[PDB]
Design a protein around this ligand. Structure first.
Ligand SMILES: CCN(CC)c1ccc2c(c1)Oc1cc(N(CC)CC)ccc1C2c1ccccc1C(=O)OCCOCCn1cc(CO[C@@H]2O[C@@H](C)[C@@H](O)[C@@H](O)[C@@H]2O)nn1
Ligand SMILES: CCN(CC)c1ccc2c(c1)Oc1cc(N(CC)CC)ccc1C2c1ccccc1C(=O)OCCOCCn1cc(CO[C@@H]2O[C@@H](C)[C@@H](O)[C@@H](O)[C@@H]2O)nn1
Length: 266
């Protein structure tokens, strides 16, 4: 099927969805009044994205996988340009997260059954300590004040949660113990986490609200899943993108059940 990645920002919100199809990545954007086609058009078979607000200006980084490299593509208000990211890979699935306004970035790559990590601290790219088995990776992160926490979901036999608390990596209380493709989001400082798994054409949901994992009401057909969420005061909003072949369907949580969203690819 096509493979998607989703970021959002502000409270309207704005959404960017990236779809990899026949080696091309294209962008559908939402401004609060209709979906439209963004400038982004780069080569790639797989995509992940992350973004951050500097005051009220969005900065977007798309990690596009092209055989023996992943290229970073940068939006900073005035067009797409190539980023300082470099890797060396084999015919590659990535997950990205970022935090603060510096910002800091962590990119996880599953290459031939191993997940590895590249980190950006504002000075340059370096190799992170993370290195664990997996064919499939998703990531979410949250600030507790100025301390970053990172939850990596590595799917190989079992999906394993790997938690970073700022001084070491450990196995988390998640494990839903073939060919799982996961997408993760989180919100607040508890935090809440939702992990979506495409397995055998069903997408299903696992939930953390600080007091143990449980199966969520989310249940929709798809072979690929991406997700983004945003808070408005105390209210969470989620957009899940479920894909089968070239058909991507949006599912929205606005606090009153999962409903089909307006998203089209066109
Ligand atoms: C574009 C081509 N690439 C990528 C392959 C590249 C370019 C330069 C270097 C490169 C690689 O590697 C090294 C390595 C060394 N070392 C140890 C590190 C051994 C001697 C030394 C020099 C180079 C240098 C280097 C040599 C001499 C002088 C300066 C540098 C340098 O600027 O370095 C790169 C970062 O410096 C400032 C340039 N830069 C890049 C950005 C990017 O900011 C954007 O936004 C960020 C948030 C990220 O998304 C980021 O990826 C994105 O591009 N901001 N500033
Ligand atoms: C207080 C002692 N008792 C017996 C009286 C008890 C104990 C645990 C639960 C209990 C009750 O109830 C639930 C109920 C659910 N529901 C509601 C029917 C969702 C399927 C889930 C887990 C337990 C859980 C639960 C089970 C296992 C692990 C943790 C919890 C838990 O955090 O328990 C307390 C927190 O539970 C969350 C309550 N709830 C409902 C929703 C809204 O929906 C969820 O969140 C949305 C944002 C979406 O992701 C949606 O798909 C997803 O299902 N969010 N939270």
């Amino acid at each position: 099927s096509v493979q998607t990645a989703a970021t959002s920002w502000g409270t309207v919100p704005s959404i960017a969805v990236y779809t990899a199809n026949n080696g091309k990545i294209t962008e559908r954007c939402w401004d609060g009044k209709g979906w439209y086609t963004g400038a982004f058009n780069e080569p790639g078979d797989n995509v992940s994205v992350t973004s951050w607000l500097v005051g009220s200006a969005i900065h977007i980084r798309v990690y596009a996988s092209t055989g023996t490299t992943t290229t970073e593509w940068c939006w900073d208000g005035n067009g797409w340009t190539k980023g300082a990211y470099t890797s060396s890979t084999v015919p590659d699935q990535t997950a990205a997260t970022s935090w603060g306004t510096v910002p800091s970035i962590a990119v996880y790559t599953a290459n031939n059954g191993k997940i590895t990590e590249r980190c950006w601290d504002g000075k340059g790219w370096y190799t992170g300590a993370f290195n664990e088995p997996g064919d499939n990776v998703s990531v979410t992160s949250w600030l507790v004040g100025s301390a970053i926490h990172i939850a990596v979901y590595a799917s190989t036999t079992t999906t394993t949660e790997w938690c970073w608390d700022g001084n070491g990596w450990t196995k988390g209380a998640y494990t839903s113990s073939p060919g799982d493709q996961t997408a993760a989001t989180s919100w607040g400082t508890v935090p809440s986490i939702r992990v979506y798994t495409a397995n055998n054409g069903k997408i299903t949901e696992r939930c953390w609200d600080g007091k143990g994992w449980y199966t969520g009401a989310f249940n929709e057909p798809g072979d690929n899943v991406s997700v983004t969420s945003w808070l408005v005061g105390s209210a969470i909003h989620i957009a899940v993108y479920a894909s089968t072949g070239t058909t991507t369907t949006e599912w929205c949580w606005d606090g009153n059940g999962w409903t089909k969203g307006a998203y089209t690819a066109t």
